[PDB]
Amino acid sequence: TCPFYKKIPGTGFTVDAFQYGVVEGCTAYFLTHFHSDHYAGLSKHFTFPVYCSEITGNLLKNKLHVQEQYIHPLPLDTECIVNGVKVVLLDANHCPGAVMILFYLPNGTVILHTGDFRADPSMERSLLADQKVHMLYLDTTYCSPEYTFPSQQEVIRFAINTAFEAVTLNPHALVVCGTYSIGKEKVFLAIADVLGSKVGMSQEKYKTLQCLNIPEINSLITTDMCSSLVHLLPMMQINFKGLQSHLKKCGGKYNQILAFRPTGWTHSNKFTRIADVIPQTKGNISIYGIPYSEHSSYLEMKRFVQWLKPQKIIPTVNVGTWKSRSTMEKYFREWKLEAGY
Numbered sequence: 001t002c003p004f005y006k007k008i009p010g011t012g013f014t015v016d017a018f019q020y021g022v023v024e025g026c027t028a029y030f031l032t033h034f035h036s037d038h039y040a041g042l043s044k045h046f047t048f049p050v051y052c053s054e055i056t057g058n059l060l061k062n063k064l065h066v067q068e069q070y071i072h073p074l075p076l077d078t079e080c081i082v083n084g085v086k087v088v089l090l091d092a093n094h095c096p097g098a099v100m101i102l103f104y105l106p107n108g109t110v111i112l113h114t115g116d117f118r119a120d121p122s123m124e125r126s127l128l129a130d131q132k133v134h135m136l137y138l139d140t141t142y143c144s145p146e147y148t149f150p151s152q153q154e155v156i157r158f159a160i161n162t163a164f165e166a167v168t169l170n171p172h173a174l175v176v177c178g179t180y181s182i183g184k185e186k187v188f189l190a191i192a193d194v195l196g197s198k199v200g201m202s203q204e205k206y207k208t209l210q211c212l213n214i215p216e217i218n219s220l221i222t223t224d225m226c227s228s229l230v231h232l233l234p235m236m237q238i239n240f241k242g243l244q245s246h247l248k249k250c251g252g253k254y255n256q257i258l259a260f261r262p263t264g265w266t267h268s269n270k271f272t273r274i275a276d277v278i279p280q281t282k283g284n285i286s287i288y289g290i291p292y293s294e295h296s297s298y299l300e301m302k303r304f305v306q307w308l309k310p311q312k313i314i315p316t317v318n319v320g321t322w323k324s325r326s327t328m329e330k331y332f333r334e335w336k337l338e339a340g341y
């Protein structure tokens with residue numbers, strides 16, 4: 001059965017709720033982004049209306065074979081009417097095609113559902129600036145002060161400088177980057193760009209990337225692995241065994257691998273700066289775990305909510321334990337007392 005925090009009161013709508021069969025009284029199903037915990041349940045046999053971004057719609061049609069007649073893409077930053085209710089889709093600064101959804105209820109209540117997001121001060125100047133929000137359905141993934149990580153720009157600087165140094169010292173080094181879903185494409189695109197290479201990958205992953213409207217993409221990616229010195233592999237294969245085996249397949253073209261695992265947060269964050277990050281090394285293989293996050297840090301999340309001043313917050317992540325819920329509720333009260341709303 002569909003949980004309460006995926007239902008929007010006073011509407012026919014649910015958010016990210018495709019794994020519960022036919023939801024009682026749901027007339028339209030919204031999908032914030034194409035990540036499997038959120039899309040779980042969609043396929044060619046789905047015959048209710050799905051509302052989403054253009055990019056999410058490309059992925060529904062091409063990757064899951066949802067029929068075109070049930071896909072309703074909306075433009076961003078544009079007031080739209082859906083089953084008699086005004087909505088707006090806003091950029092979530094998560095993975096490509098990810099949105100937040102503003103709902104303008106017929107009784108006058110305004111609700112923001114963030115989906116998954118990385119809060120940013122640029123959001124303080126979207127269509128959010130222009131009215132009060134009563135209820136916030138919040139991505140609370142890292143809602144605890146231990147969760148600090150650097151900006152995405154500092155992390156990309158580290159990666160480009162690391163890769164460029166390694167390959168300049170040894171022109172026979174291969175760079176590998178791990179992936180398992182959409183998101184974090186800047187990691188492998190920035191490295192390929194500094195090295196003057198395209199990124200090589202499987203046909204299935206190339207197809208996924210062609211759905212994303214990334215400009216000049218035919219220029220940066222390829223399925224010809226032989227012509228590429230930046231390769232993408234499944235995240236599961238980013239270990240010494242998996243990488244040793246890959247290196248065998250390259251036929252003596254290469255004699256060293258430098259690999260990157262973008263993670264979210266890891267506890268090496270609490271003690272070490274990005275500048276100071278070091279790899280795990282075995283023989284001719286080095287693996288860097290780099291803290292490239294597509295979710296809000298605690299301080300980014302706090303700043304957003306203190307700016308927005310919602311009357312009620314409904315967490316959508318970490319809701320399964322009493323200890324987690326209690327912790328999050330205590331931070332929301334601090335934030336409200338400190339800011340005066």
Ligand code: NI
Binds near residue numbers: 033035094116
């Ligand atoms: Ni996500």
